[PDB]
Amino acid sequence: PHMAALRPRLVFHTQLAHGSPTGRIEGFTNVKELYGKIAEAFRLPAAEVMFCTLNTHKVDMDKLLGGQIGLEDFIFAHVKGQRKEVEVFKSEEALGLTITDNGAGYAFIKRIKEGSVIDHIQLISVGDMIEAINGQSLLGCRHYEVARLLKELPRGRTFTLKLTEPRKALGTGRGTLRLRSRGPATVEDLPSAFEEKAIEKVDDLLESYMGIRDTELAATMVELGKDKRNPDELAEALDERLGDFAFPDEFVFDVWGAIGD
Amino acid sequence: GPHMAALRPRLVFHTQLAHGSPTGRIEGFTNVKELYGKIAEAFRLPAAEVMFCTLNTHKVDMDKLLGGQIGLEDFIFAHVKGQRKEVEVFKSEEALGLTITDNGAGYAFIKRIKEGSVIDHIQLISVGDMIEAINGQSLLGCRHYEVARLLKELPRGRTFTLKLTEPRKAFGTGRGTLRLRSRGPATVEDLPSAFEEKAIEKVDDLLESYMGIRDTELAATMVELGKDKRNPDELAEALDERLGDFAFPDEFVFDVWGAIGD
C-alpha cells in the first residue's frame, strides 16, 4: 500500500488558541486553505487567522506550524491464515523462542534467535500463533504459560506444535501531512533524526544571514539539496524558486555543508 | 478548551487487513479485545480471526507490534488577531535584535527577540506579534525575508513606527497518544519520554530473561506502576495488586526497580 491511498480523508481537530470548543476540518492542500477551513469552522473571516501552533495553545515558537502536520497511527490487522503442524526435536535446553500474546487469548512467536534449533527449522516463523503443544490446546493461555510449557518439554524428545500462520500478501512509519510552500501537499514519512538536525542547521543559517526563520523553507531546502552533488548544483536549485531571497553564495556553501553526512 | 480531556469527542482510527483490504474506520474500543472485535466487524469476519495488530506497516514487524499505545494526529491551535499596538522606535546603527517569520500566507510576525537588544528593551513588543505596517506602509502580503530586510535597511537615527497586532491569548511535541492499559482504563496521555521508552525496553528484556516472553504493554504497565514508588518494596506492593497473578520473584522486582531508574 502506498501511503496516500490509506486514508480517503485527512481530518484534523482544531481550537482557537485563546479558547474555543473543538472543530473538525479537512480538505486543504496548502496553508492558505488550512487557514480558510479553520476560520470557516469558527465563523471567522479568514483574514483573522495569524498562525498555527501544534499541540499547544501557547505562543510557543518551538511548536509553530512549520510544514508538517502529523497523522495518527494506522492499524494493520493480521488474521488467521495457513494452519501448520510441525515436529521439532529438542536438541538443546534452549530452543531459541520468545513468546508474546495478543492480550486476548492468542499467544504467538515474537522472536526466533538466529542459530537456534527453531531457526534451523524452516517451517516456523515469527508471527505464527501457537495453538497446541503435544496436543495440549493453548487457546486462552498467556504467553508465559506457553513459554513455561516450552521450557519444560523433555530435552531428549520430539515435540509437535500446532501453528496458525497469519495471512500475508528507520522509524515508526507513522505518516505526516507535508504542507509544501511551492506546491500541493503530500503525505510523507517523518523526517529522520539526521534530517531534523540538518533542518535546524539550515534554519540557523536563515537567521544569521537573512534575519528570518522558517522551518518549512528549511525543510524544503534540505529535501531540495540532498541529491545535489556540489554547491553549484545546489545554488542552481535555490535560484530556481528563491531568487528574491538573494542568497549570498556563502549561504549556499553553508547550506551545502549543513545538509551532508 | 485545551485540557487533554476536552480535545476530541471521539478517537477514530483507520485500519486494513495486513494481507490486503480496503480501509475501514473504527471507534469505541476501550481494550484490545474490543479493538479486535471492531476490526473484525468492519471487515465482516468472526472476531476469533484477528490474530494481532501492527502499527503503520502491513509486514510482520514485531518492532511495530501494537504494544499499548496508539498515537494520535497533531492538534491544531489557531492564533487569531487580537490587540492592536503602535510602537515608535529609534533606529540605531546596531541590529534591532529581531527574527522574523511568516505564516506562509502574507502575515509576517516576530519569532524571536534577542535578550538585551533594542527590541528587548521595548517591552511593548512581543514574540508572536505580527507586523502590519512600518511607518504606515502596509506589510500585509510581504514575506518574512522582505520584512527582515526593510527593518535592516531603516535609516539610522530616525524613529520608525510599528503597527502591530497581538494574537488573542488565553488568561516533547505534546502530541497525544491513546494508552490502552491492560490493567486500567484506556486514556489519552502524553507520549512517553525518551527515559520511559528506554526503561520499558529494559523491562521487556527482563520479561524475556525471567519468563521467556516479551510484552511491551506489560512492560509499560510495570514502568507506570513504579514511577512514583520510593523503593523496591513499594514497587513489589503495586505489582502484587495489579499483577499478582504473575507471581514475580523478588530478584525480578528488584531488577525491574533498576530498569526504571538512572
Residue numbers in the entry:
A (entry chain B): 49 to 217, 236 to 327
B (entry chain A): 48 to 218, 237 to 327
Q: What do the authors say?
A:
We crystallized the GH1-PDZ-GH2 domains of mouse GIPC1 and determined its X-ray crystal structure to 1.9 Å resolution. The GH1 domain adopts an ubiquitin-like fold composed of four β-strands and one α-helix, although it lacks obvious sequence similarity to ubiquitin. A prominent feature of the GIPC1 structure is that two molecules in the asymmetric unit form a domain-swapped dimer. The domain swap is the result of an exchange of the last β-strand between the two GH1 domains. Due to the domain swap, the PDZ domain from one molecule is located in close proximity to the GH1 domain of the dimer partner. The overall shape of the dimeric GH1-PDZ module resembles a canoe with the two GH1 domains at the middle and the two PDZ domains curving upwards at each end. The GH2 domain wedges itself between the PDZ-GH2 linker and the PDZ domain, reminiscent of a passenger sitting in the canoe formed by the dimeric GH1-PDZ modules. Notably, the loop between helices α1 and α2 in the GH2 domain partially occupies the PBM-binding groove in the PDZ domain. Conversely, the PDZ domain blocks one face on the GH2 domain that binds myosin VI (as defined by the structures of the GH2/myosin VI complexes below). Therefore, the apo-GIPC1 structure represents the state in which the PDZ and GH2 domains mutually inhibit each other.
GIPC1 (GAIP interacting protein, C-terminus 1) and its two paralogs GIPC2 and GIPC3 are universal adaptor proteins that bind and regulate vesicular trafficking of many transmembrane proteins. GIPCs contribute to the endocytosis process by tethering the cargo proteins on endocytic vesicles to the motor protein myosin VI. GIPCs contain a central PDZ (PSD-95, Dlg and ZO-1) domain that mediates the interaction with the C-terminal PDZ-binding motif (PBM) in cargo proteins. The transmembrane receptor PlexinD1 contains a C-terminal ‘SEA’ motif that constitutes a PBM and interacts with GIPC1.
